[PDB]
């Protein structure tokens, strides 16, 4: 019974450390990017007025 209890504790600890590591690595990755079809241009003349 004590062996089963400590095995459950070890399993809980390893799954918890896996979860915290996964959350940590996810929390820093560059998930989304902004692609630029046309970058900002440098105007030569004035469009307005």
């Amino acid at each position: 019974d004590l062996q089963l209890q400590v095995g459950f504790a070890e399993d809980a600890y390893k799954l918890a450390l896996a979860a915290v590591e996964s959350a940590r690595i996810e929390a820093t990755r560059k998930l989304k990017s902004l692609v630029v079809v046309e970058p900002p241009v440098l105007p030569e003349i004035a469009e307005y007025p």
Partner: peptide
């Protein structure tokens, strides 16, 4: 929880 379980196991070994 793991610390408490290990403490119980090492206490009941004797």
């Amino acid at each position: 929880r793991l610390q408490e379980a290990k403490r119980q196991l090492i206490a009941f070994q004797a």
